[PDB]
Amino acid sequence: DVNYKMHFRMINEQQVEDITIDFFYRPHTITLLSFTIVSLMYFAFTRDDSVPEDNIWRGILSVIFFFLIISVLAFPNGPFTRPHPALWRMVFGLSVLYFLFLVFLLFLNFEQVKSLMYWLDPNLRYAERIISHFDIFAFGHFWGWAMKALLIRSYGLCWTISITWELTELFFMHLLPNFAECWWDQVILDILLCNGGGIWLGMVVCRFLEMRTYHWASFKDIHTTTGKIKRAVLQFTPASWTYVRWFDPKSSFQRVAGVYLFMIIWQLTELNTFFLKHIFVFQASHPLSWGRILFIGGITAPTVRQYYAYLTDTQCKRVGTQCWVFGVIGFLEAIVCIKFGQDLFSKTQILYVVLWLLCVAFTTFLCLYGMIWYAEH
Amino acid sequence: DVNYKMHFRMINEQQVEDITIDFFYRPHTITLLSFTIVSLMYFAFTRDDSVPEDNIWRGILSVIFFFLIISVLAFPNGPFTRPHPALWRMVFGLSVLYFLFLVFLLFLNFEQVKSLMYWLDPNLRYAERIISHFDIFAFGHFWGWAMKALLIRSYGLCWTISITWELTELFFMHLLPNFAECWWDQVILDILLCNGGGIWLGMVVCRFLEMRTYHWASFKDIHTTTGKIKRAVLQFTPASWTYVRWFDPKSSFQRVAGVYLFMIIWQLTELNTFFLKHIFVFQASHPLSWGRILFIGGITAPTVRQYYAYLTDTQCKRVGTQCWVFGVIGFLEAIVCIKFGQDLFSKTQILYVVLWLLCVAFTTFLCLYGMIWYAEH
Ligand SMILES: CCCCCCCC/C=C/CCCCCCCC(=O)O[C@H](COC(=O)CCCCCCCCCCCCCCC)COP(=O)([O-])OCC[N+](C)(C)C
Ligand SMILES: CCCCCCCC/C=C/CCCCCCCC(=O)O[C@H](COC(=O)CCCCCCCCCCCCCCC)COP(=O)([O-])OCC[N+](C)(C)C
Ligand SMILES: CCCCCCCC/C=C\CCCCCCCC(=O)O[C@H](COC(=O)CCCCCCCCCCCCCCC)COP(=O)([O-])OCC[N+](C)(C)C
Ligand SMILES: CCCCCCCC/C=C\CCCCCCCC(=O)O[C@H](COC(=O)CCCCCCCCCCCCCCC)COP(=O)([O-])OCC[N+](C)(C)C
Ligand SMILES: CCCCCC(=O)OC[C@H](COP(=O)(O)OC[C@H](N)C(=O)O)OC(=O)CCCCC
Ligand SMILES: CCCCCC(=O)OC[C@H](COP(=O)(O)OC[C@H](N)C(=O)O)OC(=O)CCCCC
Ligand SMILES: CCCCCC(=O)OC[C@H](COP(=O)(O)OC[C@H](N)C(=O)O)OC(=O)CCCCC
Ligand SMILES: CCCCCC(=O)OC[C@H](COP(=O)(O)OC[C@H](N)C(=O)O)OC(=O)CCCCC
Ligand SMILES: CCCCCCCCCCCCCC
Ligand SMILES: CCCCCCCCCCCCCC
Ligand SMILES: CCCCCCCCCCCC
Ligand SMILES: [Ca+2]
Ligand SMILES: [Ca+2]
Numbered sequence: 234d235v236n237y238k239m240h241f242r243m244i245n246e247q248q249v250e251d252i253t254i255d256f257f258y259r260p261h262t263i264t265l266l267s268f269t270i271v272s273l274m275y276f277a278f279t280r281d282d283s284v285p286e287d288n289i290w291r292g293i294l295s296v297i298f299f300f301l302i303i304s305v306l307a308f309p310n311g312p313f314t315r316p317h318p319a320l321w322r323m324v325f326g327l328s329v330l331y332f333l334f335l336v337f338l339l340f341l342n343f344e345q346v347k348s349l350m351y352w353l354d355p356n357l358r359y360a361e362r363i364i365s366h367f368d369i370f371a372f373g374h375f376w377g378w379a380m381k382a383l384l385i386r387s388y389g390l391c392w393t394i395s396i397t398w399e400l401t402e403l404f405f406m407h408l409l410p411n412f413a414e415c416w417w418d419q420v421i422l423d424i425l426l427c428n429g430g431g432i433w434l435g436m437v438v439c440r441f442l443e444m445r446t447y448h449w450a451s452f453k454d455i456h457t458t459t460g461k462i463k464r465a466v467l468q469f470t471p472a473s474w475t476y477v478r479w480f481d482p483k484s485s486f487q488r489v490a491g492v493y494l495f496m497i498i499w500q501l502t503e504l505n506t507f508f509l510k511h512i513f514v515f516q517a518s519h520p521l522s523w524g525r526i527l528f529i530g531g532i533t534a535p536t537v538r539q540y541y542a543y544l545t546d547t548q549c550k551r552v553g554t555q556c557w558v559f560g561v562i563g564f565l566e567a568i569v570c571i572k573f574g575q576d577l578f579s580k581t582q583i584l585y586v587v588l589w590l591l592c593v594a595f596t597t598f599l600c601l602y603g604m605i606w607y608a609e610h
Numbered sequence: 611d612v613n614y615k616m617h618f619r620m621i622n623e624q625q626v627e628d629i630t631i632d633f634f635y636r637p638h639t640i641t642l643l644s645f646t647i648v649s650l651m652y653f654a655f656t657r658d659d660s661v662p663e664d665n666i667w668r669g670i671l672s673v674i675f676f677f678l679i680i681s682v683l684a685f686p687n688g689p690f691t692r693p694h695p696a697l698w699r700m701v702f703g704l705s706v707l708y709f710l711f712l713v714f715l716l717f718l719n720f721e722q723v724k725s726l727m728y729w730l731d732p733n734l735r736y737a738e739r740i741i742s743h744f745d746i747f748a749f750g751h752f753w754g755w756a757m758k759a760l761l762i763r764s765y766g767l768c769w770t771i772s773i774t775w776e777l778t779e780l781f782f783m784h785l786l787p788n789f790a791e792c793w794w795d796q797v798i799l800d801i802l803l804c805n806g807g808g809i810w811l812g813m814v815v816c817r818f819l820e821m822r823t824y825h826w827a828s829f830k831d832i833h834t835t836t837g838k839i840k841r842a843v844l845q846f847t848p849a850s851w852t853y854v855r856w857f858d859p860k861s862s863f864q865r866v867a868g869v870y871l872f873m874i875i876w877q878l879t880e881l882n883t884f885f886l887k888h889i890f891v892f893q894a895s896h897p898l899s900w901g902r903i904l905f906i907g908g909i910t911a912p913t914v915r916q917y918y919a920y921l922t923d924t925q926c927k928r929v930g931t932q933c934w935v936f937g938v939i940g941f942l943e944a945i946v947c948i949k950f951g952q953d954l955f956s957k958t959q960i961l962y963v964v965l966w967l968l969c970v971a972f973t974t975f976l977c978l979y980g981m982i983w984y985a986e987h
Contacts, residue, residue, distance in 0.1 A: 285722055288717050296714050299713045307685055332676070
């Protein structure tokens with residue numbers, strides 16, 4: 234049990250190894266205690282609070298900001314400790330904020346949630362060819378897969394969900410009347426280039442990042458300025474890379490069904506994005522659209538490394554807190570879509586979702602066979 | 611530094627020693643995840659959301675409850691580990707909730723805060739002799755002083771602050787026109803009977819608890835039913851008692867100033883209560899008054915034991931998170947009272963507060979002399 238509680242602190246609160254500059258890792262909470270009071274003193278005595286509309290906004294911004302300060306002192310930093318552990322306590326701080334925001338939304342009705350969205354943005358109330366298709370969103374979609382494949386470390390897992398989702402969005406665009414997106418948009422442009430190009434780049438880096446000899450000289454020791462610039466910049470890159478093996482030839486029925494649940498919660502988070510944008514009508518350029526995608530993308534990096542650790546390591550015996558929070562967020566967003574999306578379906582079929590369930594297991598079982606046989610040949 | 615980071619986890623997250631019934635200390639976070647998802651599914655698909663006020667109220671309640679659930683998984687449990695550490699993680703979660711609520715209030719104006727209070731309770735908008743004086747509030751004050759003296763473990767500190775605060779409240783009742791509370795009420799009945807009896811009982815229980823031989827037989831091992839009942843009931847009592855010595859004959863200027871700051875913040879936490887209750891006019895029977903007092907009293911129990919540990923232990927090098935949160939709460943309440951209390955003073959004097967500052971140091975210096983000389987005689 235000494236290992237069973239120590240192995241959780243390698244998942245939940247990964248510690249910094251080989252600290253040389255100790256100014257960056259010594260707490261100053263009393264100075265943080267003195268900063269918050271003087272910060273709020275300036276805002277409680279000099280800010281003009283004569284308008285009620287801008288008082289609620291700045292109060293919300295301050296609650297979010299000062300919850301990030303509390304998260305630095307009290308929240309776990311995941312299995313990541315670069316560039317600083319505190320930047321991952323502040324990402325876990327936003328996960329809890331977004332989790333509790335969804336808990337609130339389940340208890341409202343559609344007229345209150347729509348009135349809430351219009352408060353955030355009043356403009357929401359009133360609302361060759363292939364080359365032009367590539368926009369700033371296609372760049373984000375390419376780098377989303379180049380980051381997912383960086384952590385999943387599998388062609389079979391990433392192409393299984395790249396293909397199934399694009400097939401689903403092609404099918405789910407039967408309801409959407411106005412868009413004229415032809416099938417090649419999400420079967421040739423997306424599956425091949427935006428996804429496969431992203432998947433290829435992400436899996437190419439994993440080979441590089443995991444075969445690299447991680448030798449980290451201290452910043453003070455380097456004498457040449459170009460080395461100091463190299464060392465300063467290299468702080469924002471991983472200090473080590475885990476060797477990921479989702480499947481084993483002797484993998485049990487528990488492990489095989491732990492990668493099956495992994496690729497259902499993965500695809501659940503893609504139905505959340507599709508329906509939240511459709512139930513609450515906002516354009517893809519709105520910060521509610523790509524601001525949420527960036528935040529969920531930031532959460533995913535420590536969640537994939539904590540679900541993998543729990544699933545495989547036999548001395549873990551607890552699932553990391555960030556993976557727990559990414560579990561409620563992904564499940565609650567579906568309940569939000571079912572509750573408020575009671576109207577945009579009349580006779581629509583869940584059978585495709587049921588059919589998607591089988592075609593995922595069909596591809597995990599084929600993945601195990603293609604790797605069990607791989608040892609033989 | 612191995613001790614400098616280990617000594618913080620004896621303050622922040624005190625671990626349970628000698629666990630025999632392991633059902634009470636084995637996490638089930640995935641079962642917690644399933645419970646939260648099913649509960650929110652039931653409340654999202656079954657609750658009638660046709661009234662907005664009830665929707666907002668139930669959303670607030672659910673957010674508080676699920677923040678408590680998050681705190682059970684991700685927040686430190688103080689130096690206390692009885693009856694369960696989770697019941698102190700939840701207290702810390704409530705502390706953070708209140709801290710952020712205070713952060714929000716600084717950015718509103720008085721009309722918005724009054725509207726919020728009226729939303730919380732619409733009834734707030736429209737709003738021999740000694741034997742009759744003793745009410746449930748007097749009983750609560752007596753038990754609060756008993757609990758305080760249970761942790762401070764000092765007649766000098768407790769009597770100093772009791773006397774100073776009673777004098778301050780007697781003085782501050784110069785502004786209060788309607789109340790006819792004569793000086794005897796808060797110079798004899800309060801100082802002697804309620805406060806004095808509480809202090810006496812607290813110090814008697816300190817003497818009993820710190821001289822007790824803490825031997826904890828496992829619940830399963832006891833065979834007699836009365837012994838099992840005693841062991842079950844005894845779980846809600848401290849498993850050990852720290853020997854508290856605020857002053858030493860060789861105590862430096864740092865320690866003396868630390869006790870001075872301790873008592874200054876202690877009296878600030880009473881100015882906060884007085885001025886909050888007077889600025890936001892609600893009766894002492896309203897839950898906003900005694901609920902807040904109960905919550906601050908619950909916070910105080912680990913805050914005192916963490917401030918003492920930081921102040922005296924020389925290997926601590928960090929102040930516990932509950933102490934940090936109590937500090938921000940105590941300072942932010944004062945800032946709130948200053949911001950919204952800009953009107954109920956015209957020519958009133960801070961000199962008494964300044965005079966109170968000297969008469970506290972006068973009584974710390976006299977406390978050290980009365981104990982430095984104590985060794986000689
Ligand atoms: C409407 C729909 C219609 C059709 C629906 C039909 C649905 C069909 C139903 C599908 C469900 C199938 C479930 C099968 C589960 C088998 C058990 C299993 O493998 O357990 C474990 C893994 O599993 C876990 O327990 C992991 C934690 C899970 C909870 C956190 C979620 C966070 C998600 C984050 C996802 C991130 C995604 C990121 C994407 C980029 C392994 O077994 P174990 O022995 O416990 O493990 C041994 C190791 N220890 C314990 C010794 C350490
Ligand atoms: C308007 C008014 C008008 C007139 C105003 C005038 C005001 C006049 C101004 C008075 C202020 C005087 C302050 C002097 C402080 C000297 C330094 C000192 O003693 O430091 C330390 C203690 O002090 C700390 O640092 C403790 C942490 C403080 C922050 C947490 C707050 C939570 C409160 C919770 C209170 C709970 C209350 C509960 C009540 C029931 C000790 O020195 P050190 O060497 O750091 O310690 C050695 C130990 N280590 C470091 C090795 C471990
Ligand atoms: C929070 C948890 C959820 C995560 C994302 C969830 C998805 C939601 C994400 C983003 C959408 C948020 C709404 C923005 C669109 C509304 C219209 C608009 O332009 O508003 C703009 C918002 O401009 C701002 O100032 C926004 C500030 C940030 C918002 C919260 C994220 C915290 C990140 C902290 C990161 C810290 C570091 C982290 C670790 C490194 C400007 O407003 P405006 O149009 O001029 O009108 C303003 C006045 N009213 C009308 C609004 C009253
Ligand atoms: C939270 C952080 C701050 C702490 C305290 C700060 C001080 C504030 C404290 C208490 C004051 C709260 C307001 C209550 C008075 C208003 C009028 C009234 O009677 O309201 C009642 C409130 O009844 C409830 O249901 C209250 C639920 C609890 C509230 C939060 C505390 C969480 C404790 C969790 C402890 C868990 C375990 C902890 C560890 C073991 C009933 O309402 P009503 O009159 O019928 O009208 C209802 C409808 N409207 C009008 C309200 C819309
Ligand atoms: C702005 C600073 C640029 C970078 C300046 C710089 O020299 O960084 C070095 C520091 C610490 O580096 P060490 O070599 O002491 O620890 C190394 C440790 N064992 C490890 O490899 O993890 O990095 C940070 O904390 C960066 C905080 C970034 C804050 C955003
Ligand atoms: C400004 C921030 C820039 C991004 C900062 C950055 O690169 O660090 C993020 C982490 C760093 O990994 P560690 O060395 O802390 O953990 C090591 C552990 N054994 C492991 O498996 O990595 O890696 C990623 O998630 C890389 C994907 C990008 C995620 C956004
Ligand atoms: C309702 C249960 C009544 C009490 C039933 C009972 O038998 O309690 C024993 C348990 C654990 O007691 P142990 O002897 O295993 O540990 C002892 C440990 N080393 C120590 O001394 O701290 O206490 C709780 O967790 C109580 C949780 C209360 C949850 C509110
Ligand atoms: C339902 C809850 C009932 C109250 C539960 C209860 O009595 O436990 C609270 C703690 C228990 O102390 P521990 O044994 O965990 O810590 C031991 C550590 N070395 C120490 O110094 O105590 O003690 C107090 O604060 C007592 C004051 C009352 C506080 C309200
Ligand atoms: C881990 C990454 C977290 C980043 C949070 C994303 C929030 C972006 C908000 C953008 C709002 C822009 C308003 C004009
Ligand atoms: C550590 C103790 C925490 C207790 C929280 C106190 C909150 C009480 C609220 C009572 C409201 C009653 C409304 C009728
Ligand atoms: C009209 C389209 C606007 C898209 C803005 C994208 C901003 C990307 C910021 C990325 C930060 C990491
Ligand atoms: Ca697509
Ligand atoms: Ca009084």
